[PDB]
Amino acid sequence: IPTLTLMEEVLLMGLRWNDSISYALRGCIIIELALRGKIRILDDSARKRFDLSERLIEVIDSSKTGEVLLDETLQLMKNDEPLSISNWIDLLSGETWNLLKINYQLKQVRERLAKGLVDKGVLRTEPIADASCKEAIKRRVLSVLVSRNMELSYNEYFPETTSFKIIRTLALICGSYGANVLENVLTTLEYEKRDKAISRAEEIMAQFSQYPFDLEKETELGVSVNLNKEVKEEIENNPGHDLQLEVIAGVFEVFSRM
Amino acid sequence: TGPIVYVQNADGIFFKLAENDAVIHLANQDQGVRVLGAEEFPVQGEVVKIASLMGFIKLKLNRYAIIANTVEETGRFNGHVFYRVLQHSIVSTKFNSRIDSEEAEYIKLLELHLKNSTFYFSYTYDLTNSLQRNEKVGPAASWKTADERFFWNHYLTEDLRNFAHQDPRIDSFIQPVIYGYAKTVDAVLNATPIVLGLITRRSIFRGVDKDGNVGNFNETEQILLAENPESEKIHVFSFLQTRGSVPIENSLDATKKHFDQQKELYGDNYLVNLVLNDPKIHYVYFDFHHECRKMQWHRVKLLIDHLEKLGLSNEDFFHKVIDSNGNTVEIVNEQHSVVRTNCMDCLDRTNVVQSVLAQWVLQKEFESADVVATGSTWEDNAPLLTSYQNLWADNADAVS
């Protein structure tokens, strides 16, 4: 149960608005909704013939999250036929041709997330009020992109009791790189460290774009070793949640097609 | 005419007949409709197969496309098949994030109009006119020959019309579409295989408008087919009954033009209203007096008898006889008189009167083909009666 949603984190890492950041924002919406346990992949055998990103979406819970955007998307998923991941994100981005679902596109997302951060007391209008949170998130990201052995840090917004913390961080990395806003938080690092970090993120993308994401693959970079072991330690918990993970890896697949 | 498939491309949309070949390109650069060859047809890309194309509509700076995704079989008659548009789709060349906010309102209202609306058509047959009018027209022409009043997609195909005036290949692309009802029913009376059918079309135009149009003009046609192995021939009937407003503001010249058109197209006109001295034009009034339903039906019968006393005969309809292939053998009779129904408050009354009248003529249609005996009541047959009632009921469901 995190305080900040994935999309707000991504946007926060954004500043110091392209199409990439929007697409990635919607992607973060689907990812977050999957993480909550709201949506899940339909348990069909035929859908596994196509790509994971083309698989349908099934919503189980109807409880509101409190976040405006997420609840809007939930509403849109509540009154429609089961659409695929890529098509869902496309419709939420308004990239599909059909005018029947023209009202599916989210308008002025920037102001939504802005009011979201301000009302959370994170953003000040006059420019972040709390830089410790951003620095902590950045610390996690760098702990995944640089550290030899992956270790995690926790703040009040993202406690140690947060479920799928590693998954939250990985999804954050993938989503951020999808919008190419990852370049902002690699500026402090040295050249070689950047060169390792980017391709480490590339390995994360290539590994978790499929389900089940292979963990027998040994990285050559020596960066964030035992990632597979800790991910295994994550899948030891919450059994039967394979559906949501299929969704997530599907969105990761979408990020690699941008 | 025939099915159409297309390819969606950023530069524009490329339409092409499903069955040389003409390609209808709507470019995204200038939002203009132009004709290209089969070589322009994209080798790869999404190929969408649709029932038919309604046409293009231009609002502000964008020109949208109105397409029918799928249709369901609603009627079959002498090989000719009637289709109802189940799902409609509006397609633009630009993405949803590129569409203007002002235009979104227009698309919203248009889509709202498309909802709760029943459209009907047929590839090999033009329903736009009555079977009487369709018989007076050769079998070759299709798009060129259609009623100006009931050709619903007239505006949407303006560009297509302009390109059809020059290119005959465009004629196959454009397909007549009507707003109302159109269905057939298979049955049997006195060991004779019979196929009933009903159509209903709403006019485009619009008391009396200055142009001459009266508004709310709904032409309701009742057609029939009867194959009798005893006579070795196929009989085809086409009773006709229009309705709408009535001249009672209303210009003298407008009334004159209206009546001239009505008398030129329908001949004699019996106008019945519900609560010059032209010889071929009669004015009838009727009040239900809030009686019971049965007494109301009786009153309808009495009104029918009154119309009969006015000079209206139940033998005045379109009767024809065709061959086994479909070609007509001989023309038996033509209808030179119609009964226009005008009502206050509830419109259902019009449908009721039209129904009882149509059955009163239907009995004579039966007698004319030796299906029933002289003086016999066809209404004694329960299945045919309830089929008739179901037909008119669904018609009433569609009109409202």
UniProtKB/Swiss-Prot annotation, chain A:
One of its GO terms (cellular component) is cytoplasm. Keywords: Golgi apparatus, Lipid-binding, Membrane, Phosphoprotein, Protein transport, Transport. One of its GO terms (biological process) is regulation of phosphatidylinositol dephosphorylation. Changing R110A: Abolishes phosphoinositide binding and Golgi localization. Changing W17A: Abolishes phosphoinositide binding and Golgi localization. It is a peripheral membrane protein. It comes from the Eukaryota. Phosphatidylinositol-4-phosphate-binding protein that links Golgi membranes to the cytoskeleton and may participate in the tensile force required for vesicle budding from the Golgi. Thereby, may play a role in Golgi membrane trafficking and could indirectly give its flattened shape to the Golgi apparatus. May also bind to the coatomer to regulate Golgi membrane trafficking. May play a role in anterograde transport from the Golgi to the plasma membrane and regulate secretion. Present with 1850 molecules/cell in log phase SD medium. Homotetramer. Interacts with coatomer complex. May interact with ARF1. This is Vacuolar protein sorting-associated protein 74. It comes from Saccharomyces cerevisiae (strain ATCC 204508 / S288c). The chain holds residues 64 to 341 of 345 of the full protein.
UniProtKB/Swiss-Prot annotation, chain B:
Residues 1-400 are cytoplasmic. Keywords: Endoplasmic reticulum, Golgi apparatus, Hydrolase, Isopeptide bond, Membrane, Transmembrane, Transmembrane helix, Ubl conjugation. It is found in: Endoplasmic reticulum membrane; Golgi apparatus membrane. GO terms for cellular component: cortical endoplasmic reticulum; endoplasmic reticulum; endoplasmic reticulum membrane; Golgi medial cisterna; Golgi membrane; host cell viral assembly compartment; mitochondrial outer membrane; mitochondrion. One of its GO terms (biological process) is phosphatidylinositol dephosphorylation. The keyword Transmembrane applies. Coiled coil: none annotated. Residues 110-400 form the SAC domain. It is a multi-pass membrane protein. One of its GO terms (molecular function) is phosphatidylinositol-4-phosphate phosphatase activity. The keyword Ribosomal protein does not apply. Its EC number is 3.1.3.64. It catalyses: a 1,2-diacyl-sn-glycero-3-phospho-(1D-myo-inositol-3-phosphate) + H2O = a 1,2-diacyl-sn-glycero-3-phospho-(1D-myo-inositol) + phosphate; a 1,2-diacyl-sn-glycero-3-phospho-(1D-myo-inositol 4-phosphate) + H2O = a 1,2-diacyl-sn-glycero-3-phospho-(1D-myo-inositol) + phosphate. There is a cross-link at K233, K309 (Glycyl lysine isopeptide (Lys-Gly) (interchain with G-Cter in ubiquitin)). Present with 48000 molecules/cell in log phase SD medium. Component of the SPOTS complex, at least composed of LCB1/2 (LCB1 and/or LCB2), ORM1/2 (ORM1 and/or ORM2), SAC1 and TSC3. Phosphoinositide phosphatase which catalyzes the hydrolysis of phosphatidylinositol 3-phosphate (PtdIns(3)P) and phosphatidylinositol 4-phosphate (PtdIns(4)P). Has low activity towards phosphatidylinositol-3,5-bisphosphate (PtdIns(3,5)P2). May be involved in the coordination of the activities of the secretory pathway and the actin cytoskeleton. This is Phosphatidylinositol-3-phosphatase SAC1. It comes from Saccharomyces cerevisiae (strain ATCC 204508 / S288c). The gene is SAC1. The chain holds residues 2 to 449 of 623 of the full protein.
